[PDB]
Design an enzyme around this catalytic site. Structure first.
Site, PDB file in Angstrom:
ATOM      1  N   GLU A 161      -5.258   8.278   8.188  1.00 55.64           N
ATOM      2  CA  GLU A 161      -5.056   9.169   7.038  1.00 55.64           C
ATOM      3  C   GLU A 161      -3.550   9.345   6.990  1.00 55.64           C
ATOM      4  O   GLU A 161      -2.953   9.934   7.893  1.00 55.64           O
ATOM      5  CB  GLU A 161      -5.754  10.528   7.210  1.00 55.64           C
ATOM      6  CG  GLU A 161      -7.258  10.516   6.916  1.00 55.64           C
ATOM      7  CD  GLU A 161      -7.626   9.861   5.583  1.00 55.64           C
ATOM      8  OE1 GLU A 161      -6.986  10.173   4.555  1.00 55.64           O
ATOM      9  OE2 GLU A 161      -8.566   9.036   5.566  1.00 55.64           O
ATOM     10  N   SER A 162      -2.937   8.813   5.943  1.00 53.57           N
ATOM     11  CA  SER A 162      -1.492   8.860   5.804  1.00 53.57           C
ATOM     12  C   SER A 162      -0.829  10.205   6.082  1.00 53.57           C
ATOM     13  O   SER A 162       0.108  10.271   6.882  1.00 53.57           O
ATOM     14  CB  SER A 162      -1.067   8.314   4.424  1.00 53.57           C
ATOM     15  OG  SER A 162      -1.586   9.072   3.345  1.00 53.57           O
ATOM     16  N   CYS A 175       0.846  -1.181   0.000  1.00 51.57           N
ATOM     17  CA  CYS A 175       0.000   0.000   0.000  1.00 51.57           C
ATOM     18  C   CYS A 175       0.898   1.252   0.000  1.00 51.57           C
ATOM     19  O   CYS A 175       1.724   1.438   0.899  1.00 51.57           O
ATOM     20  CB  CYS A 175      -0.921  -0.021   1.219  1.00 51.57           C
ATOM     21  SG  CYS A 175      -1.853   1.521   1.472  1.00 51.57           S
ATOM     22  N   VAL A 199      -5.785   1.438   5.676  1.00 50.89           N
ATOM     23  CA  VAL A 199      -4.441   1.612   6.215  1.00 50.89           C
ATOM     24  C   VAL A 199      -3.842   2.797   5.453  1.00 50.89           C
ATOM     25  O   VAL A 199      -4.253   3.087   4.330  1.00 50.89           O
ATOM     26  CB  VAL A 199      -3.571   0.341   6.006  1.00 50.89           C
ATOM     27  CG1 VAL A 199      -4.067  -0.775   6.936  1.00 50.89           C
ATOM     28  CG2 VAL A 199      -3.608  -0.095   4.549  1.00 50.89           C
ATOM     29  N   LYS A 213     -10.155  -8.561   5.635  1.00 45.16           N
ATOM     30  CA  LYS A 213      -9.817  -7.957   6.925  1.00 45.16           C
ATOM     31  C   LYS A 213     -10.611  -8.326   8.164  1.00 45.16           C
ATOM     32  O   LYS A 213     -11.797  -8.640   8.104  1.00 45.16           O
ATOM     33  CB  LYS A 213      -9.809  -6.423   6.818  1.00 45.16           C
ATOM     34  CG  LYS A 213     -10.399  -5.851   5.548  1.00 45.16           C
ATOM     35  CD  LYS A 213     -10.864  -4.420   5.778  1.00 45.16           C
ATOM     36  CE  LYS A 213     -10.753  -3.615   4.500  1.00 45.16           C
ATOM     37  NZ  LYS A 213     -11.178  -2.210   4.675  1.00 45.16           N
TER      38      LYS A 213
HETATM   39  S1  LIG Z   1      -3.316   1.507   0.050  1.00 46.07           S
HETATM   40  C1  LIG Z   1      -4.701   0.625   0.835  1.00 46.07           C
HETATM   41  C2  LIG Z   1      -5.918   1.513   1.162  1.00 46.07           C
HETATM   42  N1  LIG Z   1      -5.535   2.700   1.925  1.00 46.07           N
HETATM   43  C3  LIG Z   1      -6.024   3.892   1.565  1.00 46.07           C
HETATM   44  O1  LIG Z   1      -6.785   4.055   0.610  1.00 46.07           O
HETATM   45  C4  LIG Z   1      -5.570   5.083   2.442  1.00 46.07           C
HETATM   46  C5  LIG Z   1      -6.316   6.340   1.933  1.00 46.07           C
HETATM   47  C6  LIG Z   1      -6.311   7.496   2.952  1.00 46.07           C
HETATM   48  N2  LIG Z   1      -6.972   8.648   2.351  1.00 46.07           N
HETATM   49  C7  LIG Z   1      -4.876   7.840   3.408  1.00 46.07           C
HETATM   50  O2  LIG Z   1      -4.353   7.168   4.308  1.00 46.07           O
HETATM   51  O3  LIG Z   1      -4.291   8.861   2.794  1.00 46.07           O
HETATM   52  C8  LIG Z   1      -6.866   0.671   2.041  1.00 46.07           C
HETATM   53  O4  LIG Z   1      -6.730   0.573   3.269  1.00 46.07           O
HETATM   54  N3  LIG Z   1      -7.863   0.036   1.400  1.00 46.07           N
HETATM   55  C9  LIG Z   1      -8.837  -0.805   2.118  1.00 46.07           C
HETATM   56  C10 LIG Z   1     -10.180  -0.705   1.426  1.00 46.07           C
HETATM   57  O5  LIG Z   1     -10.971  -1.663   1.554  1.00 46.07           O
HETATM   58  O6  LIG Z   1     -10.412   0.328   0.780  1.00 46.07           O
END
Ligand SMILES: *SC[C@H](NC(=O)CC[C@H](N)C(=O)O)C(=O)NCC(=O)O
Ligand SMILES: *SC[C@H](NC(=O)CC[C@H](N)C(=O)O)C(=O)NCC(=O)O
Lengths: 237, 237
Positions: A81-82, A28, A68, A55
């Site tokens: 939120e990253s 990710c 995540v 999950k």
């Molecule tokens: S990369 C995997 C996905 N993460 C995100 O989309 C984080 C987006 C937030 N806006 C951020 O953290 O910036 C994820 O967890 N996907 C799971 C799902 O089922 O969508």
């Protein structure tokens, strides 16, 4: 140990003092942001990878949205939120700041992120291309966004988006460029020379280098992921 | 004086020292964020309203995207994106902070904003409703987002989203609630009691009260705006 936790797994115990935990996923790009910041600042932490295709229900207790990255500290505080997790790590932990102290300079990194905010959604639409035609049209869309970024460097005349030294903003956008290759979208950075040099300077970064994933690995992950395999996240194990 | 600047207008001169300028629009909720912060912190500033339906080409020199708000200081520094402009004003100017100093507490305000980030887009889709059916379906969409916000207050048990005292996060989401009425979407906050009380406590705020717009004024603006009238932004003059 890097193996993910999915439906049926038991919720993890408390985070030990002196360490911060990140609920992640090896492939990710949003979570890579956080992990890059964690390495750069030398923050002690543990990682729990989440099987996003299958999950654990307890995870929504970690993040209502169910995505995540997510950080959890010894006090049991959860942050998602990253970008927020990253800004948090920079403020709460020792070391050289990844973000400027100067208000205007900091706001600039923020404006550059806004400038790039369209890429992650494009990458999603791209990975879903079917023919050379969709592909061609996708290359033009990425092309328009890459120029917005090249102008910044053009104007700045520095190695990285925030200066001659790599900083927060570089780490925030890097993951998507990291995948550019594996996604066969490089002929998009041709008309953007400086941006192409930036990519080269980034790969030379010790933090970036330590977390860089192999093309074959991401290729394997994507095959499974695009198929919705509960094994995708664990590709390679 | 509040009259907007449109195509053909002359680009403004430098911002005088000791003052900060905001390129705004009297009925824009994103720019109200900035203006609310400007009032709350008692920051000296001047306002230049932009005719968004007929904007001056020189404005894109202010913001590449061509949207408001945008701040410009005496040093000639330009900052766009409402949240960024707000965070900037809190850091660069004297006074009590609108954002917490505490990393986790600050990250929380940020997570709440993320929680609300869907509303502005819903409000756009709403203002474009046609029949009672579209309307009904719009009320349910707003309804789901309002509960996410009521849970926060439910959990916190405080007057405002960041504590018992109003803070950054309240000002950031307020504008859209301000228009809830004029948009006939209140029966959406019924199933959300605390959120409804919050709206009442906000209207009692001196800063909020000083910048609050009349329903008739916003109604007049929207009539023209929805029609794309080059006079919309200047409704009332
Ligand atoms: S990369 C995997 C996905 N993460 C995100 O989309 C984080 C987006 C937030 N806006 C951020 O953290 O910036 C994820 O967890 N996907 C799971 C799902 O089922 O969508
Ligand atoms: S409210 C008028 C419009 N402003 C914005 O959409 C600001 C959005 C940013 N993301 C922000 O500041 O948060 C506007 O300027 N519209 C002009 C147009 O032609 O779109």
């Amino acid at each position: 140990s890097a193996r993910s936790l999915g439906k049926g797994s038991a919720p993890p115990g408390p985070v030990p003092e002196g360490s911060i935990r990140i609920y992640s996923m090896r492939f990710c790009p949003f979570a890579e942001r956080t992990r890059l910041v964690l390495k750069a600042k030398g923050i002690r932490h543990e990682v729990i990878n989440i099987n996003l295709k299958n999950k654990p229900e307890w995870f929504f207790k970690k993040n209502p949205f169910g995505l995540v990255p997510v950080l959890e500290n010894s006090q049991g505080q959860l942050i998602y939120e990253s970008a927020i997790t990253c800004e948090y790590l920079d403020e709460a932990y020792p070391g050289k700041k990844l973000l400027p102290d100067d208000p205007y300079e900091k706001a600039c990194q923020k404006m550059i992120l806004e400038l790039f905010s369209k890429v992650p959604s494009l990458v999603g639409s791209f990975i879903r291309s079917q023919n050379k035609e969709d592909y061609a049209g996708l290359k033009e869309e990425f092309r328009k966004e890459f120029t917005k970024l090249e102008e910044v460097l053009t104007n700045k005349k520095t190695t990285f988006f925030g200066g001659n030294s790599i900083s927060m903003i570089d780490y925030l956008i890097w993951p998507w460029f990291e995948r550019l290759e594996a996604m066969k979208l490089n002929e998009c950075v041709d008309h953007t020379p400086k941006l192409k040099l930036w990519m080269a300077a980034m790969k030379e970064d010790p933090t970036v280098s330590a977390l860089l994933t192999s093309e074959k690995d991401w290729q394997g992950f994507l095959e499974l992921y695009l198929q919705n395999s509960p094994e995708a996240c664990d590709y390679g194990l």
